[PDB]
Amino acid sequence: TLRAAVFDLDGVLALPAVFGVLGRTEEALALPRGLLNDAFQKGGPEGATTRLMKGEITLSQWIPLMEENCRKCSETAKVCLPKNFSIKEIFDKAISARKINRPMLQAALMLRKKGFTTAILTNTWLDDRAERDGLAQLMCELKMHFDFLIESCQVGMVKPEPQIYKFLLDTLKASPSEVVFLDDIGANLKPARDLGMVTILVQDTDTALKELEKVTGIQLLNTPAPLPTSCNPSDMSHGYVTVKPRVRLHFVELGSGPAVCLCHGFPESWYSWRYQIPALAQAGYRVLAMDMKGYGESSAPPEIEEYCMEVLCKEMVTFLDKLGLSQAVFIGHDWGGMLVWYMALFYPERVRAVASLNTPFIPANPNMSPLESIKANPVFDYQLYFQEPGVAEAELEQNLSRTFKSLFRASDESVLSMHKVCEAGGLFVNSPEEPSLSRMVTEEEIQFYVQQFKKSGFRGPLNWYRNMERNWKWACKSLGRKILIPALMVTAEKDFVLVPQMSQHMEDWIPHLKRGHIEDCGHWTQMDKPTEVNQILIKWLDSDAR
Amino acid sequence: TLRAAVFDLDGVLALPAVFGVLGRTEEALALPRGLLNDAFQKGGPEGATTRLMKGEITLSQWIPLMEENCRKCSETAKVCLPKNFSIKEIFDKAISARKINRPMLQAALMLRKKGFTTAILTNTWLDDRAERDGLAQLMCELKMHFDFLIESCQVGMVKPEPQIYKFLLDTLKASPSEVVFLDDIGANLKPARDLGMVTILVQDTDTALKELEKVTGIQLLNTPAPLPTSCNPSDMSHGYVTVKPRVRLHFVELGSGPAVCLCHGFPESWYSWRYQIPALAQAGYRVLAMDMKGYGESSAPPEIEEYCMEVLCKEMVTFLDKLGLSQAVFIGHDWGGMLVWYMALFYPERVRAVASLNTPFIPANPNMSPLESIKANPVFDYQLYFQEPGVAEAELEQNLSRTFKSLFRASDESVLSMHKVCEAGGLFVNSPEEPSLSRMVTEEEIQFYVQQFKKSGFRGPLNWYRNMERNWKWACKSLGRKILIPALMVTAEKDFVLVPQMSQHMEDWIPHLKRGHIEDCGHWTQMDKPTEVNQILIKWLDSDAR
Numbered sequence A, B: 001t002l003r004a005a006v007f008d009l010d011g012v013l014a015l016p017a018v019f020g021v022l023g024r025t026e027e028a029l030a031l032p033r034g035l036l037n038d039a040f041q042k043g044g045p046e047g048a049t050t051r052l053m054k055g056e057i058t059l060s061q062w063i064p065l066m067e068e069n070c071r072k073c074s075e076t077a078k079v080c081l082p083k084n085f086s087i088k089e090i091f092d093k094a095i096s097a098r099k100i101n102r103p104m105l106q107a108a109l110m111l112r113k114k115g116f117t118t119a120i121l122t123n124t125w126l127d128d129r130a131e132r133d134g135l136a137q138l139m140c141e142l143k144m145h146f147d148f149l150i151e152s153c154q155v156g157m158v159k160p161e162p163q164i165y166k167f168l169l170d171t172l173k174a175s176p177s178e179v180v181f182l183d184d185i186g187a188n189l190k191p192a193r194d195l196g197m198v199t200i201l202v203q204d205t206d207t208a209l210k211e212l213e214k215v216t217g218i219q220l221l222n223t224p225a226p227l228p229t230s231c232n233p234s235d236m237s238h239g240y241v242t243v244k245p246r247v248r249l250h251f252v253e254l255g256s257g258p259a260v261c262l263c264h265g266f267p268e269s270w271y272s273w274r275y276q277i278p279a280l281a282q283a284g285y286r287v288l289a290m291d292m293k294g295y296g297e298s299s300a301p302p303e304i305e306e307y308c309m310e311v312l313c314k315e316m317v318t319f320l321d322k323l324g325l326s327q328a329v330f331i332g333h334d335w336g337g338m339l340v341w342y343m344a345l346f347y348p349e350r351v352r353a354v355a356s357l358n359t360p361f362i363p364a365n366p367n368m369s370p371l372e373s374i375k376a377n378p379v380f381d382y383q384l385y386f387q388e389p390g391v392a393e394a395e396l397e398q399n400l401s402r403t404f405k406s407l408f409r410a411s412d413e414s415v416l417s418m419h420k421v422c423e424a425g426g427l428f429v430n431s432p433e434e435p436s437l438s439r440m441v442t443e444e445e446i447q448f449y450v451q452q453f454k455k456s457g458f459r460g461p462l463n464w465y466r467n468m469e470r471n472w473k474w475a476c477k478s479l480g481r482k483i484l485i486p487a488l489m490v491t492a493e494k495d496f497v498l499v500p501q502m503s504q505h506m507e508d509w510i511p512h513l514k515r516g517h518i519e520d521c522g523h524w525t526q527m528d529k530p531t532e533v534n535q536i537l538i539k540w541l542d543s544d545a546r
């Protein structure tokens, strides 16, 4: 029967409420109890505050009216307001102290996840103060999780007027008995209750959620820890830069602040960063999540040499030039990890900081051909399989769904063996026609990759492995250097190819290297352990790139 | 005969040279004359410095080697280095003091403009210092003006070794006698001179340019003031955001720092900001230059109401949400000017600062229908002409080249009369079939607009004028408000429609409004007076949005 859930902002989705700041302010200042609440509410439907809430006046215009109300209330209560008494000051503090009430948000998210339509209905104001960005940020962070945001001051109506509730119902396309409405102010619940909506009077969050759970019959309290926010491709800003006549690079872009360029591995996509992109933007960065050359909406020329590390790096430099960025933080996984270490070594002036997931920095051995070095380690046999043009392409393109569903597996989910792939005749020779779906991914997410790889297939991607010799000669030029910019290496306990021990000598070349390590994490790090990846990157960003 | 010009960076394109910093440092510190230059050059082809210049080691690795060289030189000269003597410190100061030598750049630009191939050939280093961003910025600013940038440390060779000159020639695809090469170091000129290149020994800039002028036969000195840098469409980052199912907005994006959203007028394009986009990025902003809805690569739905101010503004807000920007500075011209004032009034929390070129803020008159208000002023008659769907579209789409070449005219170039357009039967009834080309635009630039308007024509654009009533009712809701965020109004002396006097009462609504005024400037402000527009916007940005 219930299909919709509506939440207030103040005192419900965000805490502490600014009304309670009026209580504590009175106390702090030893003013008459309720004096500030009286001044705030003065004149009722025709007072200063309603005009504010209705969008008639802005916050800055209101401040002096509330001041005057405070004067009038104090005279009649026969007291004096403190020297320095400051409504602007009081409200700036209050409004910056107010934060998202995380458990309420996560309950709203869960209900949306089970198919509820969700909304924020709030009495709020047009905020034109010097410090208004604080609130614009809060509202952005909250509103992206909801179907609708209805603001008294944009619609010209206020709780508890009955018309806003009708406007609510009409926005929801729902009848009153399909809606639960939560509010901390009982007078605002009354009109919902009159039309027969379920209402919840929100005092402490846990009790409200207990009521919310009982009435929707969905578990909201004590639920396991949710994944980070993911990205919907068609809600993102998509960018395109031509780095040379036949080559355009695509990327998705979110956030403001220092530029952070994410570089995926093989055979992946910008979308492999889907759990990091919102979290890093939210953390105060400008994320640029590439399709690396060969992939997705980026160009994919056929020639092998178009994909050697030298050419790929020069092109990432051009990509910064054309966007007008003197630097970016470069963060890479798997092949993209190898690439960002090379960016650090050859273009340190363009790299604000460098991080790699899984891929260690190992200097080229000038005394051993790279092919030889690859044959030394049985777990790289799949790279030799990749050498002969066409062979891996035919197997990997043959059935894309089976391809990604085989590849993208957590460590406990019967990972492909990386072992004696050439001898066996292919990567999938010993895997099912229809693999089961990994816990890491949904069927829809597998189908995004499938549709991406329909544009160019696997030739470009495989070519990243076909420049062993050419990359070795380029790398050899850098053997005298060290990496002395800020650097982070993140190892994954259960990556059985890019093993954590392979990174053990990195401090010889990167003396101030910082590290994170993720346990129980297989090769597909960002979607295996997105929560831990996010925490490790944001902490290193804030300390080293900030 | 001469087809190519090559410039050094230090002492030629950038001043003062870091070598002269070695001179002044010696003097400042009363060290033996030339001691620092000896230490720098110690070991010659096999010393620390050549290894640096060749890319063998990074700047941070070199610093302690130069230190040691300074110690060794001082011992043998039987002196002591100062307490606190600091190579890192000396070079940080020197490298940040170094700036683009503007007259040399503008000469290089001019030669490129007359068809020279131009290049920077420099001995430089891999810069990994904490403060490396300074130089990455310099090099970006310079390199975008040249065909090639050849850096000793990326190519593994140094002036004066003969191989770099051969590598230069081969890059230029030019024979030695077609090249002029300019350098402040005579030993570096010698090998160019050996192959028979024209060389110029650069001491003071003016004499070098005098030589450069004599030998190329092009005027380089005392030339008139050049236009600001323009944008080549196919070198820009192009972005696309879907703000709702049928509507995607396109924009071009350059620079980093606070977001600055440029909103063009009718019937224009992101490209009408072409002279502002590089200058504002260079000034430390992230420019987002829109195709506004109806135009270019943005969607252009047919329905009139899709283009009322309310819908257009909500969509600009969604555009920020999806890009993850809590605010932007909004700068508008003509119709975009009207729109940004509305953004200031209805979404002050999303607008960091607002500026308009030409378009004044005038509050809706609640006592007079807007049509009536438009009929009151003969110079708005062209807006009535625009009302009847199809009529203006047929005239404007009939011949696009004639359309833009008629519209885009400086004040002295027989502007269209805005006068009695309905009576006369059209905007062009009294203009030539083939207008001459305005001084403001090139034939190629007219053809960019023509190709843009081939995608959707004039229906969407004209619809911005077809919501008089609907915009009036929305505006009336804001009549109690003031605009109290940072605001700039820029009037144009010879805009005979959006006249400067029309802005005279703006301080009643925007009490802290700031102003600029541009004399001898017609309606197409950004391309009429791009230099003055750039200076006025950057100054107001740095003081009010920074």
Ligand SMILES: Nc1nc2ccc(C(F)(F)F)cc2s1
Residues within 6 Å of the ligand: A266, A267, A382, A407, A416, A418, A427, A495, A496, A497, A498, A522, A523
């Ligand atoms: N630990 C690792 N598992 C895998 C599985 C597949 C591949 C692929 F075939 F895609 F390259 C690389 C690795 S690395």
Ligand SMILES: Nc1nc2ccc(C(F)(F)F)cc2s1
Residues within 6 Å of the ligand: B266, B267, B382, B407, B416, B418, B427, B495, B496, B497, B498, B522, B523
């Ligand atoms: N001073 C002014 N000149 C013109 C010329 C044309 C138009 C157009 F037809 F494009 F709307 C508007 C103006 S405003």
Ligand SMILES: [Mg+2]
Residues within 6 Å of the ligand: A008, A009, A010, A011, A012, A017, A183, A184, A185
């Ligand atoms: Mg409340």
Ligand SMILES: [Mg+2]
Residues within 6 Å of the ligand: B008, B009, B010, B011, B012, B017, B183, B184, B185
């Ligand atoms: Mg020099």
